[PDB]
Design a protein around this ligand. Structure first.
Ligand SMILES: *[C@@H]1O[C@H](CO)[C@@H](O[C@@H]2O[C@H](CO)[C@@H](O)[C@H](O)[C@H]2NC(C)=O)[C@H](O)[C@H]1NC(C)=O
Ligand SMILES: *[C@@H]1O[C@H](CO)[C@@H](O[C@@H]2O[C@H](CO)[C@@H](O)[C@H](O)[C@H]2NC(C)=O)[C@H](O)[C@H]1NC(C)=O
Ligand SMILES: *[C@@H]1O[C@H](CO)[C@@H](O[C@@H]2O[C@H](CO)[C@@H](O)[C@H](O)[C@H]2NC(C)=O)[C@H](O)[C@H]1NC(C)=O
Ligand SMILES: *[C@@H]1O[C@H](CO)[C@@H](O[C@@H]2O[C@H](CO)[C@@H](O)[C@H](O)[C@H]2NC(C)=O)[C@H](O)[C@H]1NC(C)=O
Ligand code: NAG
Lengths: 87, 49, 106, 50
């Protein structure tokens, strides 16, 4: 009766590709790609920089790196379980 | 099909960092509307003259 | 929020029913690869950069600020000591200079 | 598809043009919203294979 649904300009795979590019930039380069050229940095070193941003020394991140990685992986898994288990 | 952008594989490794040796002072423009035209309509004069 | 890049300052300009912000930002450029390490092992102690990052040009280790390449000698004044070398993953062996060491020697 | 109804609808003026223009503005605004949220990088970065 005269109603039409126009498709979005960006399809779901291209929006997913944009999110993938953002994830790759924030993983391989930290915040450098958002302010200019993407500068590579190891991810523990990037996490240490983020630790300094919140006022915690780098040594705390490096000494407890396995624990921090395990906690991060567990939290990401809990996020997937919580999304899969909550309607 | 529209290209999202140029591919840029960042050369990530566990012991390599990229440090800038120079800088660019970049000035960019941001245009923001603030106000509109203040219009008043006499309802009696518009409908009835 | 105030332009692309690290924001330095901004300048307002009036416009018809609007405002134009000239955002002056700092953009890094001419980046160079370096070999990096989280910490420096010296005398059984782990040294971490106080404000910068450890970089290596291939043979020598330096400490530099993170947003501009300015290599400096790794001393006890720009590093801090926390723990031994057994815990940090990827720690490398390099000397750490002491500024007080030539003073008591002479 | 009634011609008589459209002829009577033309007596009300440009209401239909206004409604179509507003809906078109909403439709382009949604694409602008998606561009503003997701298209903030002009480089397609990729993770390393390892
Ligand atoms: C840092 O080193 C990496 C690898 O040694 C460089 O990345 C290569 O760059 C060339 C030139 O564009 C490409 O053809 C290769 O495919 C890249 N390799 C990888 C693994 O990405 C990188 O360019 C160097 N950085 C700088 C600033 O010179
Ligand atoms: C850092 O970049 C600036 C440009 O932003 C370089 O200055 C240029 O240097 C070349 C050759 O030395 C001159 O021909 C240009 O006229 C300069 N441009 C400006 C705007 O001054 C500068 O040399 C670079 N520094 C380093 C160490 O690479
Ligand atoms: C890494 O940087 C150091 C510091 O500049 C370089 O060592 C100097 O190299 C020059 C040229 O060979 C010599 O004249 C100096 O006497 C060296 N200084 C010291 C303290 O050794 C070193 O050559 C650089 N290495 C690379 C691979 O670029
Ligand atoms: C960094 O230095 C430490 C100590 O100077 C080295 O550890 C020694 O390694 C040798 C050979 O593996 C052993 O025989 C010694 O018993 C170790 N001593 C200690 C106190 O651990 C270490 O190998 C060096 N690392 C590198 C890459 O050269
Ligand atoms: C970095 O990776 C290399 C091999 O790619 C490995 O030999 C080395 O131990 C790694 N270092 C760290 C700190 O993970």
């Amino acid at each position: 009766n005269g109603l039409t649904v126009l498709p979005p300009l960006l399809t779901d795979e291209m929006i997913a590709q944009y999110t993938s590019a953002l994830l790759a930039g924030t993983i391989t380069s930290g915040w450098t790609f958002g302010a200019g050229p993407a500068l590579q940095i190891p991810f523990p070193m990037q996490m240490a920089y983020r630790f300094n941003g919140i006022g915690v020394t780098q040594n705390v991140l490096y000494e407890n790196q396995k624990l921090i990685a395990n906690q991060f992986n567990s939290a990401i898994g809990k996020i997937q379980d919580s999304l899969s288990s909550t309607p | 099909t529209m290209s999202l952008g140029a591919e840029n594989s960042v050369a990530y490794s566990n012991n390599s960092i990229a440090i800038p040796t120079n800088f660019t002072i970049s000035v960019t423009t941001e245009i923001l509307p603030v106000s509109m035209t203040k219009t008043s309509v006499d309802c009696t004069m518009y409908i009835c003259g | 929020f105030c332009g692309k890049g690290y924001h330095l300052m901004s300048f307002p300009q009036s416009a018809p029913h609007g405002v134009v912000f000239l955002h002056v930002t700092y953009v890094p450029a001419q980046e160079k690869n370096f070999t990096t390490a989280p910490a420096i092992c010296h005398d059984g102690k782990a040294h971490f950069p106080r404000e910068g990052v450890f970089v290596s040009n291939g043979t020598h280790w330096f400490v530099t600020q993170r947003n501009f390449y300015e290599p400096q000698i790794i001393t006890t004044d720009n590093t801090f000591v926390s723990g031994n070398c057994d815990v940090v993953i990827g720690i490398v062996n390099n000397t750490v200079y002491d500024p007080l060491q030539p003073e008591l020697d002479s | 598809d009634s011609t008589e109804c459209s002829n009577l609808l033309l007596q009300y003026g440009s209401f239909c043009t206004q409604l179509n223009r507003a809906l078109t503005g909403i439709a382009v605004e949604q694409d602008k919203n998606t561009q503003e949220v997701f298209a903030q990088v002009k480089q397609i970065y990729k993770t390393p294979p390892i």
